[PDB]
Tab-separated table of C-alpha atoms and ligand atoms in Angstrom:
chain	number	residue	atom	x	y	z
A	1	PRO	CA	15.736	-9.616	-18.055
A	2	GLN	CA	16.424	-12.252	-15.436
A	3	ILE	CA	15.439	-11.168	-11.935
A	4	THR	CA	16.805	-12.974	-8.915
A	5	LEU	CA	14.898	-12.915	-5.618
A	6	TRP	CA	17.519	-11.942	-2.990
A	7	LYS	CA	15.747	-8.543	-2.829
A	8	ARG	CA	12.079	-7.679	-3.481
A	9	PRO	CA	11.441	-7.759	-7.264
A	10	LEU	CA	10.454	-4.078	-7.555
A	11	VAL	CA	10.206	-2.450	-10.961
A	12	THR	CA	9.078	0.848	-12.407
A	13	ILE	CA	5.588	1.025	-13.860
A	14	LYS	CA	3.889	3.848	-15.701
A	15	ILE	CA	0.121	4.285	-15.342
A	16	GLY	CA	-1.879	7.456	-16.057
A	17	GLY	CA	1.381	9.158	-17.097
A	18	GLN	CA	2.811	8.714	-13.584
A	19	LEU	CA	5.813	6.577	-12.640
A	20	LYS	CA	5.405	4.311	-9.643
A	21	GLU	CA	7.179	1.337	-8.031
A	22	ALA	CA	5.498	-2.069	-8.103
A	23	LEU	CA	6.203	-5.637	-6.874
A	24	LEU	CA	6.188	-8.530	-9.347
A	25	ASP	CA	4.099	-11.169	-7.496
A	26	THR	CA	3.543	-14.634	-8.958
A	27	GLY	CA	1.334	-15.371	-5.920
A	28	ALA	CA	-1.295	-12.766	-7.015
A	29	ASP	CA	-4.068	-13.534	-9.510
A	30	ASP	CA	-4.725	-9.811	-9.997
A	31	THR	CA	-2.904	-6.472	-10.233
A	32	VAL	CA	-3.572	-4.275	-7.188
A	33	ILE	CA	-2.673	-0.572	-7.180
A	34	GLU	CA	-2.703	2.038	-4.383
A	35	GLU	CA	-5.422	4.740	-4.495
A	36	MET	CA	-5.197	6.834	-7.667
A	37	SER	CA	-7.394	8.227	-10.390
A	38	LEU	CA	-8.135	6.066	-13.420
A	39	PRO	CA	-10.479	6.704	-16.349
A	40	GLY	CA	-13.768	5.039	-17.092
A	41	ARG	CA	-16.186	2.989	-15.053
A	42	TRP	CA	-15.346	0.514	-12.320
A	43	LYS	CA	-16.943	-2.654	-11.001
A	44	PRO	CA	-16.829	-4.132	-7.480
A	45	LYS	CA	-14.525	-7.013	-6.479
A	46	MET	CA	-13.452	-8.775	-3.303
A	47	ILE	CA	-9.948	-10.144	-3.179
A	48	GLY	CA	-8.241	-12.365	-0.639
A	49	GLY	CA	-4.739	-12.116	0.758
A	50	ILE	CA	-2.931	-13.518	3.744
A	51	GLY	CA	-4.594	-11.225	6.257
A	52	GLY	CA	-8.177	-11.566	4.921
A	53	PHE	CA	-10.315	-9.910	2.235
A	54	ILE	CA	-10.406	-6.363	0.879
A	55	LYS	CA	-12.924	-4.500	-1.329
A	56	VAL	CA	-11.331	-2.972	-4.467
A	57	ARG	CA	-12.409	-0.963	-7.536
A	58	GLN	CA	-11.929	-3.002	-10.739
A	59	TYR	CA	-11.009	-1.003	-13.874
A	60	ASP	CA	-10.750	-2.898	-17.189
A	61	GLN	CA	-8.591	-2.233	-20.251
A	62	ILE	CA	-6.076	0.106	-18.514
A	63	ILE	CA	-2.764	0.872	-20.304
A	64	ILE	CA	0.210	0.200	-18.047
A	65	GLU	CA	3.929	-0.027	-18.783
A	66	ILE	CA	5.819	-2.598	-16.642
A	67	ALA	CA	9.617	-2.556	-16.594
A	68	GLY	CA	9.363	-1.114	-20.133
A	69	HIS	CA	6.866	-3.679	-21.432
A	70	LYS	CA	3.396	-2.634	-22.512
A	71	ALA	CA	0.344	-4.272	-21.009
A	72	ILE	CA	-3.368	-3.362	-21.353
A	73	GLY	CA	-5.655	-5.096	-18.884
A	74	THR	CA	-7.485	-5.075	-15.597
A	75	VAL	CA	-6.177	-3.147	-12.574
A	76	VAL	CA	-7.878	-3.058	-9.173
A	77	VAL	CA	-7.540	-0.145	-6.787
A	78	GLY	CA	-7.653	-0.548	-3.038
A	79	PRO	CA	-5.785	-0.598	0.284
A	80	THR	CA	-2.581	-2.491	-0.337
A	81	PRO	CA	0.824	-2.400	1.341
A	82	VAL	CA	2.482	-1.938	-2.092
A	83	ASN	CA	1.560	-1.777	-5.787
A	84	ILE	CA	1.366	-5.438	-6.942
A	85	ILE	CA	1.703	-6.746	-10.517
A	86	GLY	CA	-0.080	-10.107	-10.591
A	87	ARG	CA	-0.337	-12.906	-13.099
A	88	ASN	CA	-2.961	-11.255	-15.308
A	89	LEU	CA	-0.318	-8.716	-16.457
A	90	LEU	CA	2.815	-10.850	-15.857
A	91	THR	CA	1.461	-13.154	-18.599
A	92	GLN	CA	1.021	-10.164	-20.930
A	93	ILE	CA	4.701	-9.228	-20.599
A	94	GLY	CA	5.775	-12.839	-21.142
A	95	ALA	CA	7.113	-13.514	-17.637
A	96	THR	CA	7.955	-17.017	-16.498
A	97	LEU	CA	9.302	-18.487	-13.270
A	98	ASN	CA	12.413	-20.618	-13.782
A	99	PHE	CA	14.508	-22.969	-11.613
B	1	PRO	CA	11.530	-26.178	-15.133
B	2	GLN	CA	9.922	-23.172	-16.844
B	3	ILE	CA	6.594	-22.209	-15.310
B	4	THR	CA	4.207	-20.013	-17.210
B	5	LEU	CA	1.785	-17.961	-15.158
B	6	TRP	CA	-1.441	-18.666	-16.963
B	7	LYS	CA	-2.456	-20.595	-13.841
B	8	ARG	CA	-1.396	-20.402	-10.198
B	9	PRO	CA	2.229	-21.731	-9.808
B	10	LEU	CA	1.409	-24.567	-7.430
B	11	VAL	CA	3.972	-27.269	-6.668
B	12	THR	CA	4.379	-30.202	-4.312
B	13	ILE	CA	6.525	-29.675	-1.237
B	14	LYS	CA	7.715	-31.940	1.565
B	15	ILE	CA	7.942	-30.403	5.071
B	16	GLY	CA	7.898	-32.000	8.482
B	17	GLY	CA	7.423	-35.407	6.830
B	18	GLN	CA	4.227	-34.346	5.005
B	19	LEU	CA	3.480	-33.746	1.355
B	20	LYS	CA	1.606	-30.531	0.679
B	21	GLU	CA	0.657	-28.195	-2.155
B	22	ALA	CA	2.159	-24.709	-2.085
B	23	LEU	CA	2.164	-21.515	-4.122
B	24	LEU	CA	5.486	-20.090	-5.428
B	25	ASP	CA	5.193	-16.382	-4.541
B	26	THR	CA	7.882	-13.930	-5.698
B	27	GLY	CA	6.078	-11.156	-3.804
B	28	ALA	CA	6.362	-12.811	-0.339
B	29	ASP	CA	9.428	-12.083	1.845
B	30	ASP	CA	8.700	-15.153	3.983
B	31	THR	CA	7.489	-18.764	3.675
B	32	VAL	CA	4.088	-19.189	5.312
B	33	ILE	CA	2.561	-22.617	5.943
B	34	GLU	CA	-0.939	-23.535	7.242
B	35	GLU	CA	-1.147	-24.838	10.813
B	36	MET	CA	1.007	-27.896	11.471
B	37	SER	CA	3.512	-28.972	14.092
B	38	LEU	CA	7.236	-28.611	13.434
B	39	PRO	CA	10.105	-29.677	15.719
B	40	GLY	CA	12.201	-27.343	17.795
B	41	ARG	CA	11.871	-23.889	19.205
B	42	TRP	CA	9.660	-21.145	17.839
B	43	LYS	CA	8.790	-17.568	18.614
B	44	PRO	CA	5.758	-15.403	17.901
B	45	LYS	CA	5.705	-13.065	14.935
B	46	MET	CA	3.263	-10.842	13.045
B	47	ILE	CA	3.329	-10.792	9.247
B	48	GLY	CA	1.405	-8.462	6.981
B	49	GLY	CA	-0.085	-8.876	3.522
B	50	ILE	CA	-3.181	-7.901	1.599
B	51	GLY	CA	-5.997	-7.860	4.178
B	52	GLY	CA	-3.739	-6.909	7.085
B	53	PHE	CA	-1.657	-8.933	9.560
B	54	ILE	CA	-1.760	-12.426	11.011
B	55	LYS	CA	0.023	-13.889	14.018
B	56	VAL	CA	2.342	-16.814	13.220
B	57	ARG	CA	4.891	-19.087	14.891
B	58	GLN	CA	8.436	-18.649	13.488
B	59	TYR	CA	10.598	-21.818	13.254
B	60	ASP	CA	14.215	-21.496	12.105
B	61	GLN	CA	16.463	-23.973	10.216
B	62	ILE	CA	13.598	-25.979	8.729
B	63	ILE	CA	14.275	-28.118	5.661
B	64	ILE	CA	11.763	-28.164	2.823
B	65	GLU	CA	11.810	-30.121	-0.457
B	66	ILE	CA	10.302	-27.871	-3.165
B	67	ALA	CA	9.455	-29.545	-6.474
B	68	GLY	CA	12.305	-31.918	-5.706
B	69	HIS	CA	14.883	-29.311	-4.679
B	70	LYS	CA	16.046	-29.166	-1.026
B	71	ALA	CA	16.244	-25.841	0.808
B	72	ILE	CA	16.637	-24.815	4.445
B	73	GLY	CA	15.512	-21.630	6.152
B	74	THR	CA	12.888	-19.997	8.361
B	75	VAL	CA	9.283	-21.110	8.033
B	76	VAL	CA	6.351	-19.371	9.749
B	77	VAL	CA	3.133	-21.268	10.594
B	78	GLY	CA	-0.335	-19.759	11.007
B	79	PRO	CA	-3.791	-19.155	9.567
B	80	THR	CA	-2.843	-18.495	5.975
B	81	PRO	CA	-5.471	-19.328	3.357
B	82	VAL	CA	-2.791	-21.119	1.288
B	83	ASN	CA	0.733	-22.514	1.710
B	84	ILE	CA	3.204	-19.958	0.337
B	85	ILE	CA	6.863	-20.442	-0.644
B	86	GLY	CA	8.463	-16.996	-0.403
B	87	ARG	CA	11.742	-15.404	-1.497
B	88	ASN	CA	13.752	-16.733	1.459
B	89	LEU	CA	13.455	-20.299	0.032
B	90	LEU	CA	12.932	-19.459	-3.678
B	91	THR	CA	16.478	-18.054	-3.767
B	92	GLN	CA	17.871	-21.338	-2.429
B	93	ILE	CA	16.441	-23.346	-5.303
B	94	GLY	CA	17.757	-20.816	-7.883
B	95	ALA	CA	14.359	-19.468	-8.931
B	96	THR	CA	14.288	-16.385	-11.158
B	97	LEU	CA	11.675	-14.334	-12.977
B	98	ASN	CA	12.410	-13.924	-16.716
B	99	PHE	CA	10.879	-11.776	-19.451
C	101	TPV	C1	-3.027	-9.576	-4.062
C	101	TPV	C2	-2.969	-10.720	-3.039
C	101	TPV	C3	-1.656	-11.453	-3.066
C	101	TPV	C4	-1.494	-12.598	-2.048
C	101	TPV	C5	-2.502	-13.724	-2.348
C	101	TPV	C6	-2.434	-14.957	-1.458
C	101	TPV	C7	-3.401	-15.902	-1.804
C	101	TPV	C8	-3.201	-16.760	-2.878
C	101	TPV	C9	-4.107	-17.751	-3.224
C	101	TPV	C10	-5.335	-17.794	-2.564
C	101	TPV	C11	-5.529	-16.979	-1.450
C	101	TPV	C12	-4.600	-16.005	-1.105
C	101	TPV	C13	-0.048	-13.054	-2.226
C	101	TPV	C14	0.871	-12.228	-1.573
C	101	TPV	O1	2.119	-12.296	-2.085
C	101	TPV	C15	0.616	-11.547	-0.378
C	101	TPV	C16	1.588	-10.906	0.399
C	101	TPV	C17	2.577	-10.010	-0.326
C	101	TPV	C18	1.962	-8.875	-1.130
C	101	TPV	C19	2.286	-11.658	1.343
C	101	TPV	C20	2.482	-13.022	1.200
C	101	TPV	C21	3.190	-13.769	2.161
C	101	TPV	C22	3.688	-13.186	3.316
C	101	TPV	C23	3.615	-11.778	3.436
C	101	TPV	N1	4.026	-11.208	4.591
C	101	TPV	S1	5.613	-10.732	4.646
C	101	TPV	O2	6.026	-10.342	6.041
C	101	TPV	O3	6.479	-11.926	4.137
C	101	TPV	C24	5.648	-9.453	3.445
C	101	TPV	C25	5.245	-8.181	3.816
C	101	TPV	C26	5.213	-7.139	2.889
C	101	TPV	C27	5.692	-7.376	1.589
C	101	TPV	C28	5.529	-6.363	0.653
C	101	TPV	F1	6.372	-6.397	-0.364
C	101	TPV	F2	4.316	-6.546	0.086
C	101	TPV	F3	5.471	-5.185	1.249
C	101	TPV	C29	6.124	-8.663	1.255
C	101	TPV	N2	6.125	-9.695	2.208
C	101	TPV	C30	2.868	-11.081	2.501
C	101	TPV	C31	-0.737	-11.574	0.014
C	101	TPV	O4	-1.161	-11.060	1.084
C	101	TPV	O5	-1.685	-12.232	-0.688
C	102	CL	CL1	15.514	-17.873	5.924
C	103	CL	CL1	21.710	-16.517	-7.628
C	104	NA	NA1	14.657	-24.570	14.619
């Protein structure tokens, strides 16, 4: 699809068999998800946003469907205003920014 | 142009007579610029992101040139770690996400 930006670019994602809403964010290096249970081990990470840094749990090789496109990659879990799909998975689904 | 997202989508902007680097951010409602002076009236605002909120100065009817395309709209100025072009100006230059 072609998504215009007059409204927030929110899509449906599926992770751990659950449907959730997430924001497509070309400004984010990483994919940040609200508190939930994921399988496997996690590693520590600090990420920066406009209001300062947060500590997150980094899970690698997680299966996630984004707007109907399959991705398998790193997701970080932490305090976030919204679920955010960042460039690490936007590249997996072939997304580009065009103008 | 067509911008892949393997790297951060940074472009040159012109604002207030100055050339700067800025991040094209489909996840940001607003355009947030690091501290600088702009002409005209402003009012205080709080904007929230990852990390929490920051206090900014809101200037309306500011013109920006973004990768050579002119746009006008509201710009907020404050202690952001990076200059961000948000949806309010991305729409004006016809930017879309495609996959
Ligand atoms: C995962 C971190 C993402 C990011 C990184 C910024 C950055 C980049 C390079 C280096 C350092 C830091 C980019 C980003 O879009 C925001 C947020 C949106 C998630 C952001 C950006 C700009 C302004 C706002 N505030 S707001 O009032 O315009 C706003 C508030 C909330 C939302 C909502 F959709 F997230 F809810 C969107 N916009 C927020 C952010 O806080 O940091
Ligand atoms: Cl505006
Ligand atoms: Cl349009
Ligand atoms: Na003004």
